Amino acid sequence: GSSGSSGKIFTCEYCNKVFKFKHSLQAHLRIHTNEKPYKCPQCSYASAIKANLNVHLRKHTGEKFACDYCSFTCLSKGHLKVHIERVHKKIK
Numbered sequence: 001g002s003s004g005s006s007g008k009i010f011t012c013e014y015c016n017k018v019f020k021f022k023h024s025l026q027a028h029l030r031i032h033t034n035e036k037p038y039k040c041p042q043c044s045y046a047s048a049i050k051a052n053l054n055v056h057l058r059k060h061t062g063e064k065f066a067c068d069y070c071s072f073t074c075l076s077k078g079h080l081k082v083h084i085e086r087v088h089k090k091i092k
């Protein structure tokens with residue numbers, strides 16, 4: 001059986017949210033530090049690389065492709081063919 005008389009719980013000091021593990025709190029605290037340098041001017045997105053921010057910024061002028069079998073959408077017809085082959089067909 002389990003050791004001790006009680007468990008342990010982890011809590012945010014900035015928004016009072018509660019987490020089951022310390023690693024979940026450490027990953028949550030990233031929103032309160034907001035330390036990623038390359039921030040999007042259009043949305044809440046941020047990056048550690050200017051080239052990776054450029055790979056994000058092109059999505060604000062992108063176009064979606066939609067599934068014929070479900071409600072799914074993605075930003076490439078090649079990615080859509082690979083969605084269909086995995087989710088609606090058998091994998092080759």
Ligand SMILES: [Zn+2]
Nearest residue numbers: 012014015017
């Ligand atoms: Zn918080």
Ligand SMILES: [Zn+2]
Nearest residue numbers: 040042043045
């Ligand atoms: Zn953005």
Ligand SMILES: [Zn+2]
Nearest residue numbers: 067069070072
């Ligand atoms: Zn689909």
